[PDB]
Design a protein around this ligand. Structure first.
Ligand SMILES: O=C(Cc1ccc(F)cc1)NC(=O)Nc1ccc(Oc2ccnc3[nH]ccc23)c(F)c1
Length: 289
């Protein structure tokens, strides 16, 4: 590589070598990619853990240049997950270190991709229990992150991964439609504002991926909310769960339930179901963006 890297920041990007995986225990399949965005070239990959022992994963690579800046963010955006060790939070397997260019960020591969798409798929047959369970898992992930003073900022069904055992992992690939009033007013985000977002996530779940507030100009959703509105109760959403969304949307940020109380309340509601209520999509929501 022809970039001066040690000009980086030892104390800033300290410990990228603490979670390093020797350029051997990992294998990349540059011919099969799954990531498409303004940035983010993710290909399927296999990394042999321990000494057996093949593990399927998603490798995060970067595009040559620019200077030491893009290299700094990419790495920093990887050390963000270093300590994130919770079954409902998307973790970092490691970062492989080779030269000649791009560095690698390795994530556990997720068979079912993102939550929103999984639920929108007409061939899937979720029950109220299934959907509430996904919501309970997200809450458990958030309770973990909140314990670590980590403010997500973009909690939403599109940012949650679903793995082969159907384990939801909170992740992150302006989302004003998921934002609390006070944050729409002052672009300041807190744990209490992630709760507002969680409520909206619960709604996406109960409607099976419908877009919230389809009719409103997206621009000012604030004037809309201030009129005294909230998302309507989805057909298959149990009354008690709807009372929870209404609590997550409390006008006073501090009156909102914490993620611990949410785990408690939702787990109760979840226990009452046996899996005998199938959830269908509302005709008026189908094909809506
Ligand atoms: O999510 C983060 C940081 C983070 C982690 C947890 C948080 F709560 C908040 C932020 N890092 C990412 O790089 N996110 C991400 C999320 C999804 C990604 O794409 C996949 C990864 C594994 N399996 C997949 N199947 C389809 C896409 C896919 C991906 F490459 C990266």
């Amino acid at each position: 590589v022809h970039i001066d890297l040690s000009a980086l920041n030892p104390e800033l990007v300290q410990a990228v070598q603490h979670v390093v995986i020797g350029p051997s225990s990992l294998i990349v399949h540059f011919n099969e990619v799954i990531g498409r965005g303004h940035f983010g070239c993710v290909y399927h990959g296999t990394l042999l853990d321990n000494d057996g022992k093949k593990i399927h994963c998603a490798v995060k690579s970067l595009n040559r240049i620019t200077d030491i800046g893009e290299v700094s963010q990419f790495l920093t955006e990887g050390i963000i997950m270093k300590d994130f060790s919770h079954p409902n939070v998307l973790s970092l397997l490691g970062i492989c270190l080779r030269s000649e260019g791009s560095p690698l960020v390795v994530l556990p591969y997720m068979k079912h991709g993102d939550l929103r798409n999984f639920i929108r798929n007409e061939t899937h047959n979720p029950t109220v229990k299934d959907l509430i369970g996904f919501g309970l898992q997200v809450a458990k992930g958030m309770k973990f992150l909140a314990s670590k003073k980590f403010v997500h900022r973009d909690l939403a069904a599109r940012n949650c991964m679903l793995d082969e055992k159907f384990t939801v992992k909170v992740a992150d690939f302006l989302p004003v439609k998921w934002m609390a009033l006070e944050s729409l007013q002052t672009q300041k985000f807190t744990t209490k504002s992630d709760v507002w977002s969680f409520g909206v996530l619960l709604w996406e779940l109960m409607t099976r991926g419908a877009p919230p507030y389809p009719d409103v100009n997206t621009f000012d959703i604030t004037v809309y909310l201030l009129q005294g509105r909230r998302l309507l109760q989805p057909e298959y959403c149990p009354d008690p769960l709807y009372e929870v969304m209404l609590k997550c949307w409390h006008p006073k940020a501090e009156m909102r339930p914490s993620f611990s109380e949410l785990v408690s309340r939702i787990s109760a509601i979840f226990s009452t179901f046996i899996g005998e209520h199938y959830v269908h999509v509302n005709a008026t929501y189908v094909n809506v963006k």
